[PDB]
């Protein structure tokens, strides 16, 4: 018998006992039910209430049949997709705004042949695999047109209408089974260059001042005369080039884009909210594109129609899974000729893709290029120390680096912005190696593959390279200017040299260990593969001299300058005089100083963000920056004092003097002068603290409808016990990162501390000095020679290709 | 015109264009959607679907409708209570269970019940403020009873009947005010002493093993007889004292909580998994309260009932909230007398609650006990070296620390278990300043509140002894001995005293801060003040020498052994003979693999989590004991050799057999010599590992109905604006902690490496050991001087206790 129950919900407390022996009998459970009166009052307000409609409620619902048909669920997806469609079709009618009434309108009628099609696949009348709503692409007109715009010719349907469609393709390799298309392959053209543009938080000058930069390039291609021996043919030609040119612009997440970037790029009509939040109700997309040819106007001056898709991802995500969605499924779908990636911000000279889509007609061996880059306004706002010493950096490793490894034709890139490849080198293998981590847990890869995190364009560059049956080279384009803007502060500058030197060092390590797939696999000449073997000893010896970089720096600077002064070894003073304890107090003072700076850097590196910090980091810097100059000017003094020789003037030269005989060679001395003074104040700060804190911080990386009571409780338990084994599949996977970092960084430490203390204390200056000179001159030598010879090769082989 | 999207959802790609200029003519979507009939079909078979409901469908309605409730939409909430009453009412028939069956009935009826209630409201009919369901326990027969088992007597409605209800409660202030009871406050019963056991994440062993302890403490407490002189008189006296003591288990989370200990709880008839589900389905409750007064029978012999309240929260907090669940809502609504705290897995002695009730009852101006921690089975495994070590430091701690700051009555407990205080002292300020963190965000409080984490018992018993116009004073009970469970390895216990060690780090500096509130704000008498100040001194020079503990065991370690050994200091052996280098080869020999060691050590502490660095750690420490053997072998032949003095026997007796004097004194001898050598190898890998480690990880620490399309947008841009400020708060928050501890950690580093790189360089070995003799000596005296006078107190007392 139920006990008196009658007023349990309505009282603030009463207690009850419910007897779980025999259940309650029949016929006294129907009379308390039909005793109460008050359930129809409930009822009838609940029905008055949902009488009407509301347009929140239906796109609840909506979300709520695609959370539901994700869970393979189909009886609920069926019926939540049926209320919604409903309820929008009522809501289409209320609605005085025209877009939102016709949008409205044509979501419910997709969403009511949708659940039409899910009955009848559910019935078993239509037999498919994995059923979705179907693939409607909307167009509309751009709420912005300019009537006062010239250009080539434009049909109204291509230049009124804003094209967009929702792609949920989980897997990019399978965009073009799902059905798919793009507006260029729908209206026959075959664009033959394509142009990514990577975008994350960023602000709206820098994507126009990128496009504007882009819209010249088109201009000056367009521009040139036929019949001319240096102009380019076909494609590429003039007075079509736009046609031929694709622009995909992805985002890397709707939470973190900028609002006023999402402004403008609603008012050059790439982008629309009311569209993307009516018609992607449903479907649960993964991406949204939006499909244009914006036309641009700057100032007084008309730009060319620039062809553009504007991908944007719903989640977050890595750069390299922009560039997965960005290759697999537009170069898939398109198939172009060439493929060229750059960041936004990058504003490229008239001249880039033309020199670029030279060489890589002329050449036909090509199979990866890159273009210089360069500070933008360098001499502007000289007196900052940081952006002169990052011109200086660009310039010569641009200058030295780049022109020795092309002579060899093998690049490693240096991370950010404008790289060309051709979409047939890298369409396989490469490819497959270079989106590795996407497809493969970092469980399987191991720490040492996950470690190498964006450093995935040397993967590429050493996969088109060592390519089996075969032989792609890379090419340095001098000519290919592209202007980047690069931090003001130290904090900016020590986040982002965090992340290229664990790119950088953790690649070249895989680089180096896979070296002989170049001989074993690939399918080279004779001659290329003796020449790779010369590069591959070059960089083994390039890279042994990098490891031990600090140790070598302060028994440099500890040997000649402070025990010059102690010892009396500087030339234009003399110290046989003094205390003896003047001479102790300096070396004490240098050692106990670097000592304590560098035990407050790792402790610091190691134990928070750099932002925060900023005044122990200025510090730090200021004190080895004053120390780096007394230091060159105390040797300026000795070199100067001697009255020199055959050995000394030769040892000057290839140490110093190599930069500047090689940006003479090249026309780039001015900027080498303008900034020698700004870099050689930062060596020890670059040195030690990006380092350190690259090492310290190595750390970071990335069905059942009803069921019974029995079934949720297994169901509930299950779950439980999958989160809790994800759980600690996590903390295992970080703990193993963790430990390989710190393995790594007390090797690295240890190493150099080892080192440094034995030349000390079992070698003297005289012993020591003359091996560290040969050892620089060596490597300098070989780097001027490798300028040299990229210099004599890109002015002569023009002259000189007729023969061969 | 609408265009042909007749078939835009079935086909799998379709190309549409939407004229948004005009809207769409009436008269033709009507014809449109009558001319379709599969929508007809589709209905019916979802008409035909949805005729049968579920359970699962049942209870994920009514939990959005808690959901919908919550953010304060009444009409959604009222609609989808109603359509999960009345599923839940259909469903209740189909099910065989009988237990099933009552409880989806009873809950269907409460669910319309409210239903109703709801609706009157809404009316404007009944006027409250934030209506929720009305509150309704469930009692239920007990799955296992044990027919053969023998008791005092038992009421078939207490002893058969297990009680439940969900609390919604979000501030555990208003638990009373919102209509939550009790079974103790209903039934009469006044319980005098609760018991609380915080539990989270642990084995069926650990409290089986709790609750037998407790039923042996129940049954002691009945067994002593009645007109002594040592017994107690009232409530604890005799027969009856299961009547007067609550034990209240509060678990911190179901996600976490063991899937043994469920069961075992389930089989003491505790928990019910069944009842759960069903009953919490629409309350969205905070947390789940069991109550039962369960019978434990152990092998032959029937223990004592306990009358038991099993709180289970639902989401996971930390210890200070379990707390504060207990203290404010029970101690609030069934205000006892005294509280007692305790972990699980502490097992007492049968006589710990009476020495406590004795002390409590007897004294009259104590507020707060802490009883003795022991080592469970210490003499048992006697190979482990850090069990015996963990031994010897809870001997020695508890004697000497503990007697000394019980003579002055001010005792900083140690962390861990078994802490009772009297529910009068500290009902108002310190309670409100012991909850301090959970009612205000750590941005307001600041830095240095937030990292003073799990110290909170520190900052009670300071509030208590400080309380103004009270005096309460804190006792130290000897005889109530609680046996722990102690980490066998160094990783567990690394990690404990990492916690430990923040905790008392900074309730030390918070109560040296604060102790003039002692003299300005409380009421003792001019002796306790005066006490209070000699104390107050010597915790201050206890402090300032814990500070440069490391720099000080450095210092002596390298003067003693090392020079003793390089300048002839040993007296046992003469070392005016050798070659001159293996003299400084053994002292730079000790130099090196001292700081060698120290690198490593803190660059693993702040590198990774301590669990897959074992080896590192194990070798490390391996190194320090065997240093710290041979230290102590060479001081022990040094102290041999030389003939003695008066200076010399003193110094040696009040440093090192202060232990063994204050041992011997409290019988408790025996302890110390089986531990002490396993002590002493340990004393440099507790300082420097834990200390570093601490000090490293610091960081470580915790409404519109319908709307239009307008609004949605609207709704969702302040979503996403809101979410981001929030980001934003956070890592401003977890920027300022790190930067906090960063600066803590750098000022204690440098402060010892500056302290002993001077007294290295500047200092001899003749000039500096006496004054850390003397320092040593003074700190031992005093502790010895406390200890002894805690012994004459608790073996006096009790005979001049009649004139005072
Ligand atoms: O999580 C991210 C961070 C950045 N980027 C984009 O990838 C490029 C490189 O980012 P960043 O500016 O950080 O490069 P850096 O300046 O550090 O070399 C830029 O176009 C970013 O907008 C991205 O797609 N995802
Ligand atoms: O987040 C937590 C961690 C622990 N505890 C409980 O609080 C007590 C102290 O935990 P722990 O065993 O970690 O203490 P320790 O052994 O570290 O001193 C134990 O009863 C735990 O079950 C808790 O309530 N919440
Ligand atoms: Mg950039
Ligand atoms: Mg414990």
Redesign the pocket.
């Known amino acids: 018998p139920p006990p008196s129950i009658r007023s349990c919900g309505s009282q603030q407390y009463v207690t009850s006992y419910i007897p779980t022996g025999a259940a309650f009998p029949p016929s006294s459970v129907q009379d308390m039910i039909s005793s109460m009166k008050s359930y129809a009052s409930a009822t009838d307000l609940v029905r008055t209430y949902s009488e009407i409609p509301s347009v929140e409620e239906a796109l609840s619902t909506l979300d709520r049949a695609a959370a539901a048909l994700n869970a393979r669920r189909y009886r609920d997806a069926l019926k939540l997709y049926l209320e919604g469609g409903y309820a929008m079709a009522n809501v289409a009618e209320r609605q005085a705004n025209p877009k939102i009434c016709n949008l409205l309108t044509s979501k419910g009628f997709e969403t009511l042949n949708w659940c039409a099609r899910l009955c009848d696949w559910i019935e078993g009348r239509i037999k498919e695999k994995h059923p979705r709503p179907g693939v409607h692409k909307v167009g509309i007109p751009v709420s912005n047109w300019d009537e006062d715009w010239v250009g080539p010719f434009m049909d109204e349907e291509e230049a009124r209408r804003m094209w967009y469609t929702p792609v949920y393709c989980p897997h990019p390799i399978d965009f073009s089974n799902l059905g798919y298309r793009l507006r260029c392959v729908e209206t026959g053209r075959r664009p033959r260059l394509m142009i990514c543009?990577?975008?994350?938080?960023?602000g709206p000058q820098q994507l126009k001042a990128t496009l504007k930069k882009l819209a010249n390039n088109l201009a000056y291609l367009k521009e040139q005369m036929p019949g001319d021996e240096k102009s380019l043919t076909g494609a590429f030609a003039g007075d079509d080039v736009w046609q031929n040119v694709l622009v995909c612009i992805?985002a890397?997440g709707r939470e973190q884009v900028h609002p006023k970037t999402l402004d403008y790029l609603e008012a050059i009509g790439l982008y629309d909210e009311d569209l993307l939040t009516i018609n992607s109700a449903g479907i649960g997309a993964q991406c949204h594109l939006f499909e244009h040819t914006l036309q641009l106007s700057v100032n007084g001056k008309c730009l060319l129609p620039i062809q553009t898709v504007f991908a944007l991802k719903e989640n977050?995500?890595?750069?390299l899974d922009?560039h997965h969605w960005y290759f697999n499924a537009f170069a898939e779908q398109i198939q172009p000729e060439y493929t060229a990636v750059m960041?936004?911000?990058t504003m490229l000279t008239k001249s880039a893709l033309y020199h670029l889509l030279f060489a890589f007609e002329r050449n036909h061996q090509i199979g990866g290029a890159c273009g210089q880059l360069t500070v933008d306004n360098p001499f502007e706002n000289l007196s900052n120390w940081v952006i002169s010493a990052q011109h200086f950096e660009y310039k010569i490793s641009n200058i030295l680096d780049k022109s020795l490894e092309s002579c060899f034709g093998f690049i490693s890139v240096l991370?950010?912005?404008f790289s060309a490849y051709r979409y047939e080198a890298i369409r396989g293998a490469p490819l497959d190696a270079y989106f590795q981590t996407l497809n493969i847990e970092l469980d399987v890869l191991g720490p040492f593959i996950g470690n190498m995190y964006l450093a995935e364009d040397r993967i590429l560059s050493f996969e088109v390279v060592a390519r089996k049956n075969c032989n792609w080279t890379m090419h340095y384009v001098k000519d290919a200017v592209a202007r980047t803007d690069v931090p003001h502060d130290l904090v900016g500058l020590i986040?982002?040299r965090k992340?290229?030197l664990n790119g950088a060092f953790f690649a070249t390590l895989f680089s180096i260990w896979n070296w002989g797939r170049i001989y074993s696999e690939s399918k080279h000449t004779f001659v290329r593969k003796m020449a790779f073997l010369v590069f591959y000893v070059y960089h083994l010896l390039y890279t042994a001299f990098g490891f031990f970089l600090p140790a070598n720096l302060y028994l440099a600077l500890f040997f000649i300058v402070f025990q010059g002064f102690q010892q009396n070894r500087l030339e234009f003073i003399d110290t046989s005089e003094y205390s003896q304890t003047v001479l102790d107090c300096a070396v004490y003072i240098y050692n106990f100083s670097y000592l304590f700076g560098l035990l407050m850097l790792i402790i610091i590196g190691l134990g928070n963000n750099p932002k925060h910090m900023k005044l122990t980091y200025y510090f730090v810097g200021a004190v080895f920056g004053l120390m780096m100059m007394l230091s060159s000017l105390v040797g300026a003094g000795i070199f100067f004092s001697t009255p020199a020789t055959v050995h000394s003037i030769v040892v000057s030269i290839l140490t110093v003097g190599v930069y500047f005989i090689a940006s003479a060679l090249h026309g780039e001395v001015h900027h080498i002068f303008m900034t020698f003074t700004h870099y050689t104040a930062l060596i020890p700060s670059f040195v030690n603290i990006f380092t350190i804190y690259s090492f310290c911080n190595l750390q970071d990386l990335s069905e059942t409808e009803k069921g019974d009571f029995k079934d949720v409780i297994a169901k509930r338990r299950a779950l439980e016990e999958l989160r809790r084994e994800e759980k600690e599949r996590v903390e295992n996977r970080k703990k193993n990162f963790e430990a390989f970092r710190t393995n790594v960084l007390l090797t690295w430490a240890f190493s150099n501390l080892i080192f440094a203390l034995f030349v000390v204390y079992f070698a003297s200056s005289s012993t020591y000095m003359p091996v560290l000179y040969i050892f620089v001159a060596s490597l300098n030598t070989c780097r001027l020679l490798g300028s040299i010879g990229h210099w004599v090769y890109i002015h002569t082989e023009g002259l000189r290709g007729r023969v061969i």
Request: proline content about 4%; cysteine-free.
């Open positions: 543009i990577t975008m994350y938080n960023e992805v890397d977050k995500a890595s750069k922009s960041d936004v911000g991370p950010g912005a986040s982002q992340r290229w």
